[PDB]
Amino acid sequence: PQITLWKRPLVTIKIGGQLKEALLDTGADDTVIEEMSLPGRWKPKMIGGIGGFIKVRQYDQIIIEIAGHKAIGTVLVGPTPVNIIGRNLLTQIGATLNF
Amino acid sequence: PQITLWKRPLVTIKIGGQLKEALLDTGADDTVIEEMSLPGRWKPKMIGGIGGFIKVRQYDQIIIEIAGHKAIGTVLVGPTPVNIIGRNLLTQIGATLNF
Amino acid sequence: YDQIXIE
Ligand SMILES: [Cl-]
Ligand SMILES: [Cl-]
Ligand SMILES: [Cl-]
Ligand SMILES: [Cl-]
Ligand SMILES: [Cl-]
Numbered sequence A, B: 001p002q003i004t005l006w007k008r009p010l011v012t013i014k015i016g017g018q019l020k021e022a023l024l025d026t027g028a029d030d031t032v033i034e035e036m037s038l039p040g041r042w043k044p045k046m047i048g049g050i051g052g053f054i055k056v057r058q059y060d061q062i063i064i065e066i067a068g069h070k071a072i073g074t075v076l077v078g079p080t081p082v083n084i085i086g087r088n089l090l091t092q093i094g095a096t097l098n099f
Numbered sequence C: 001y002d003q004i005x006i007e
Helices: A087-093
Strands: A010-015 A018-024 A042-049 A052-066 A069-077 A096-098 B010-015 B018-024 B043-049 B052-066 B069-077 B096-098
Touching (some): A052 A087, A069 A087
Antiparallel strands (some): B043 B052
16 A cells, blocks of 8 residues: 555554554654563563653564564564554565655 | 665755755654754744653744755754654655555 | 654
């Protein structure tokens, strides 16, 4: 699909058996999801942006379905104000910016 | 162009006759740039990012070139970690997300 | 308020 940017580019994702809404975010290096349980080991991370930093849990090798496209990669979990699909997963679904 | 996302989508912008680097950010409603002088009056605005909320200066109808495309619109000035081109100006240059 | 997420 071609998604215009008149509105926030929100899509449905499936992660951990759960359906969520998430923002396709070319400005994010990483994928960050609000608090939820995920399997495996994790390690702590600090991530920053406007307003400073938050502490998150880093889980590796997590499968996500993004608007019907499956991808695997690292997912960060923590107190993000919005669920974010960042570049680490956008690349896997072949997402590009076009103008 | 067609910009893939394996690297940060950084482009050259021109504002006030000067070249700067900025990130094309579909996760941003608005365009935010680091401290610089702009003409005219400003208005207050609060914006929220991953780490919390910040105050910025809102300047309207600012001429800005983005990867060689002309835009004229609102630019926020404040303590952002990186210069951000948000959807208000991405729509002016005809950008879409595609996968 | 408006939301700006880079990360
Ligand atoms: Cl919206
Ligand atoms: Cl849960
Ligand atoms: Cl990854
Ligand atoms: Cl590719
Ligand atoms: Cl605008």
